[PDB]
Amino acid sequence: DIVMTQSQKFMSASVGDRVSVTCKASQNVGTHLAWYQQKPGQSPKALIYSASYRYSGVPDRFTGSGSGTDFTLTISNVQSGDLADYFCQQYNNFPLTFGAGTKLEIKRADAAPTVSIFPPSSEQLTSGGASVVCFLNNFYPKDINVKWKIDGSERQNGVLNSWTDQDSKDSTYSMSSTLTLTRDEYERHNSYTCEATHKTSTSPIVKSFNRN
Amino acid sequence: HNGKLCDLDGVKPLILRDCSVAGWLLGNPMCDEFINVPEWSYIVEKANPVNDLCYPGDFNDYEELKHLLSRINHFEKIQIIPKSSWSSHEASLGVSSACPYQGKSSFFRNVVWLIKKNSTYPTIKRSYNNTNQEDLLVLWGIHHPNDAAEQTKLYQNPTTYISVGTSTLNQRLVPRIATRSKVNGQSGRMEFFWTILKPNDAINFESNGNFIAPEYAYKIVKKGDSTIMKSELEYGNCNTKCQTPMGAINSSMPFHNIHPLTIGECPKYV
Amino acid sequence: QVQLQQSGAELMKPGASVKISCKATGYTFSGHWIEWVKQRPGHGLEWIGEILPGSGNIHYNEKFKGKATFAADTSSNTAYMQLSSLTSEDSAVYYCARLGTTAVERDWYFDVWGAGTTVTVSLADPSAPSVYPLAPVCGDTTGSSVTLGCLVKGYFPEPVTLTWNSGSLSSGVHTFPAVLQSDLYTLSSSVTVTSSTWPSQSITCNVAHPASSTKVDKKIEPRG
Ligand SMILES: *[C@@H]1O[C@H](CO)[C@@H](O)[C@H](O)[C@H]1NC(C)=O
Ligand SMILES: *[C@@H]1O[C@H](CO)[C@@H](O)[C@H](O)[C@H]1NC(C)=O
């Protein structure tokens, strides 16, 4: 089987920049190569076929080049709508094989997270459970750290984190962290806080509440 | 002096318009005007016809086929192998955008690009016996794919052949799988072959892939004297006994310093 | 004019089989190959195989020779893929797609794709979510904007559909990807509105779980 290697897992670009995604086939595939675009939650869309032919409706700032083993998808004048994954496909040999995809992420001015903390609802507590939710919304760059502290001491067990894809509108990232305890363990401590470490502030952003 | 390309004696010529002899005989979809043509006195073809082989390739023994036509005045097309006759192979999917017909993908009309069926390509063993009283010009071809994956998708069998036999022909053909530069957007090739099937003789086809099978052949129903004249002119409502590739001339005076190639063979020339 | 309509999500027990469909419209069904593809998070796209409807011609990726079976119904313009002996590793999104060129052409690129069909293989039983409101902490904030939340906890399988005010409130919303712990998914969503919007106006998150055939609503009410 022919392996299609996209060495770049991620790729950054400002609007107006020129980026190129590379695809290296493990052996000759001639020009029997296609390029696709996929945005999260959507099916892929055809961009290039035969290595360099543009699919019908595709803007001419998408150009494909290469032959044999080395291929390149060049996006000139990057537009905000190009936020997507891009992967190649060879059809010179059975089985057909795809590259693992490269994620294009748009560059941006810094954005400081808005941090919000939420005690367990009075509805969950009746079920014996207690979850503390902490939202960290609309920040850039994507690198962020989150620490929970119960009565001043860090808590690492019971924390589940989730991250959004880069927003298509304002190009920011968001994060949700949930600290789940038992109702009994939740009622043994008073202070609860989530600490956010991010480039946009020297010291961590602290949001806290007291059970009383 | 001359006029244009005219009629000869009482028989009008066959004027191929942007189509070559090969495109005419194989049935290039861009040449549908030449299905069931009447008797001709001579044939006209341009120097570089636009419609030759819509799917690229070669016409085997093409020059000797042209010499054969210089002694043929009329054809009668007949169906020797109906397209519906293929039950173990797909006969209605061999079309290409290289052979457009009114915008839709098509193919040569007189031959059938057979494809595998039920993920199999069983061995073809078909014979046609010329029960007619005339000689029969038969045409077939082979597909040379671009690569082994194309061979698999179309014919399944990786190693294939075509065998054609008459009382005089013993032809075995193997496809040549090789990557090629694109012609009419195609990196594969089609190679066509021909033979004359004498009355009461039989042509025996055998193949396990890559076979462009015949459907229509040509009965030779008149063997006068014709030529393949290379000219850019056109009919040409007139008549003569002597014609040249650049114009027509009636009556006779040995004055002639224009062209040697002239039908009618009436003197003279330098 | 060309569309590929795939059947809906399915939850299957280990070792069972599933048959997903792909209805084609807008073209001659018999003139193009139908491709089948498998997409999993953290894995590259995998080609399963190929069928030319009406011809009986089928290709399988050797890796899927035992898993997949293709069929096509030319009267219905529907292509089918059956996945047998289901395991956890078969949980994925499966796409059908059409080749852009006709049957005997060489450019085998996928011009039209289906919307995909999510298959979940699990012994776990469907569980409807518990939905909890997330109201801000007590005490008045300086204001400008307030962030509300909706905690969707302990459901199986995916997916869940979360809207705010039945869908009429889509701005400033962040619905985070679900996380799996034990055999239960947990999900949260945040919405940010002007201080003058809430609580003067009501805000409610609507959680639909088609698997367990349930739709619930939790109004976000002040204090805690
Ligand atoms: C192809 O397969 C089907 C079985 O589903 C059969 O009905 C049909 O006759 C087969 N055709 C050939 C040429 O084998
Ligand atoms: C073709 O048809 C005639 C019919 O009588 C038969 O005699 C002859 O043997 C056949 N030719 C061959 C090569 O079988």
> Domain boundaries in chain C?
2-123, 124-224
C-alpha pair distances (Å), B187 with each of B29, B57, B155: 20, 10, 17
Q: Which CATH superfamily is domain C124-224 in?
A: Immunoglobulins (2.60.40.10)
* In a shared domain, residues A6 and A87: yes
B131 C-alpha vs ligand 2 centroid, how far in Å?
Answer: 8
Last residue of one domain, picked from the residues A64, A84, A108: A108
* In a shared domain, residues A98 and A170: no
Q: Token pair for residue A152?
A: 């001043």
* In a shared domain, residues A134 and A94: no
* In a shared domain, residues B151 and B226: yes
* In a shared domain, residues A125 and A187: yes
Cβ atoms of C136 and C147 closer than 8 Å: yes
**Whether residue B117 has its Cβ less than 6 Å from ligand 1:** yes
Q: Looking at residue A86, which CATH number applies to its domain?
A: 2.60.40.10
Number of domains forming the structure of chain A? 2
Half-sphere exposure of A24 (CA within 13 A, CB side): 5
Determine, for residues A131 and C132 on separate chains, whether the beta-carbon distance falls below 8 Å. yes
CA-closest candidate to residue A167, choices A142, A143, A186, A199: A142
Domain ranges, residue A67:
1-108
Question: What b-and-e string marks burial along A123-142, b requiring 16 or more CB atoms within 10 Å of the CB?
Answer: ebbeeebbbbbbbbbbbbbb
Strands (E), chain C: 3-6, 10-12, 18-25, 34-39, 46-52, 57-60, 68-73, 78-83, 92-99, 110-113, 117-121, 130-134, 145-155, 161-164, 173-175, 179-181, 184-194, 204-209, 214-219
Number of domains forming the structure of chain B? 2
The technique by which this structure was obtained is: X-ray
A100 at the C interface (CB within 8 A)? yes
| CA–CA separation, B143 and A111 (whole Å) | 62
| CA–CA separation, B118 and A119 (whole Å) | 64
**Whether residue B129 has its Cβ less than 6 Å from ligand 2:** yes
H-run or E-run covering B23: helix B21-26
Can you tell me which atom of ligand 1 is nearest the CA of B89? 13
**Would you list which residues of chain A are within 8 Å, Cβ to Cβ, of chain B?**
30, 32, 91-94
B89 C-alpha vs ligand 1 centroid, how far in Å?
Answer: 10
Determine, for residues A44 and C110 on separate chains, whether the beta-carbon distance falls below 8 Å. yes
**Resolution as reported, in Å:** 2.3
Domain ranges, residue B72:
12-233
* In a shared domain, residues A90 and A133: no
* In a shared domain, residues A74 and A2: yes
SS (H, E, C) chain A: CCCEECCCCEEEECCCCCEEEEEEECCCCCCCEEEEEECCCCCCEEEEECCCEECCCCCCCEEEEEECCEEEEEECCCCHHHCEEEEEEECCCCCCEECCCEEEEECCCCECCEEEEECCCCCHHHHCEEEEEEEEEEEECCCCEEEEEECCEEECCCEEEEECCCCCCCCCEEEEEEEEEEHHHHCCCCEEEEEEECCCCCCCEEEEEECC
Q: Token pair for residue B190?
A: 């089609």
* In a shared domain, residues A1 and A103: yes
Cis upstream peptide for A120 (omega within 30°) = no
Determine, for residues A91 and B149 on separate chains, whether the beta-carbon distance falls below 8 Å. yes
Please name every residue paired with A191 in a beta bridge, in sequence order, or none if there are none.
A210
Contacts of residue C42, defined as CB under 8 A and 6 or more positions apart, other chains included, come to none
Sign of CA dihedral C110, C116, C121, C122: positive
* In a shared domain, residues A103 and A11: yes
C-alpha pair distances (Å), A63 with each of A66, B146, C161: 10, 25, 38
The total of other beta-carbon atoms located within 10 Å of residue B255's CB is 11
Query: Chain C: residue nearest B148 by CA?
Result: C106
Sign of CA dihedral C108, C111, C112, C115: positive
